[PDB]
């Protein structure tokens, strides 16, 4: 599924991401935009053989099992394919564990490089929340 901007904001707000660990809704929408272009089916292979999955590009080395990342952990206890569903619930629940692990949203390289320190509220402007 390819979300619209306001549609995704509404879905994320309902799943409890607005101000989760102090990160306002605009941060999560901005990160999803630049990680996946709002596409729940996005995948990208990394140089170490791990793969990033889904709307928030969650990585198989630490967070989910895809059966081909040797010596990886499965800290969210999910198959990585669950992160590609049109229902973002699995992605959101796993992202909550990532953002709580100490490094906040710096875990997402695109957030660090393209959202951090910008006017992230612009990403939810005009949406009916
Ligand atoms: Cl915001
Ligand atoms: Cl933080
Ligand atoms: Na894994």
- Do residues 8 and 95 make contact, with C-beta atoms less than 8 angstroms apart? no
Range of the domain at 81: 1-129
Q: Residue 20 and residue 43: Cα distance in Å, rounded?
A: 25
Pull the structure tokens for residue 37: 């272009």
What residues have a C-beta under 5 A from ligand 2, the ion? 104
Q: After which residue numbers is the chain interrupted with C–N beyond 2.5 angstroms?
A: none
* Closest-CA residue to 91 (of 30, 19, 11): 11
The contacts of residue 84 (CB under 8 Å, 6+ apart) are 40, 41, 43, 53, 54
35 belongs to the catalytic site: yes
Tell how far the Cα of 25 is from the centroid of ligand 2, in angstroms.
Answer: 14
Strands (DSSP E) contained in the chain are 43-45, 51-53, 58-59
Q: How many domains does the chain have?
A: 1
Method used to obtain the model: X-ray
Resolution of this entry in Å? 1.8
In sign, the C-alpha dihedral spanning 39, 41, 45, 49 is: positive
CATH number of domain containing 67: 1.10.530.10
């Amino acid at each position: 599924k390819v979300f619209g901007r306001c549609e995704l904001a509404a879905a994320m707000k309902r799943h409890g991401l607005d101000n989760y660990r102090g990160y306002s809704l605009g941060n999560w929408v901005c990160a999803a935009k630049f990680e996946s272009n709002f596409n729940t089916q996005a995948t990208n292979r990394n140089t170490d053989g791990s793969t990033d999955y889904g709307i928030l590009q969650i990585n198989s080395r630490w967070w989910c099992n895809d059966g081909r990342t040797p010596g990886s952990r499965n800290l969210c206890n999910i198959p990585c394919s669950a992160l590609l569903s049109s229902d973002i619930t699995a992605s959101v629940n796993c992202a909550k564990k990532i953002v709580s692990d100490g490094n906040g949203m710096n875990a997402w390289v695109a957030w660090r490089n393209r959202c951090k320190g910008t006017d992230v509220q612009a990403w939810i402007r005009g949406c009916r929340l």
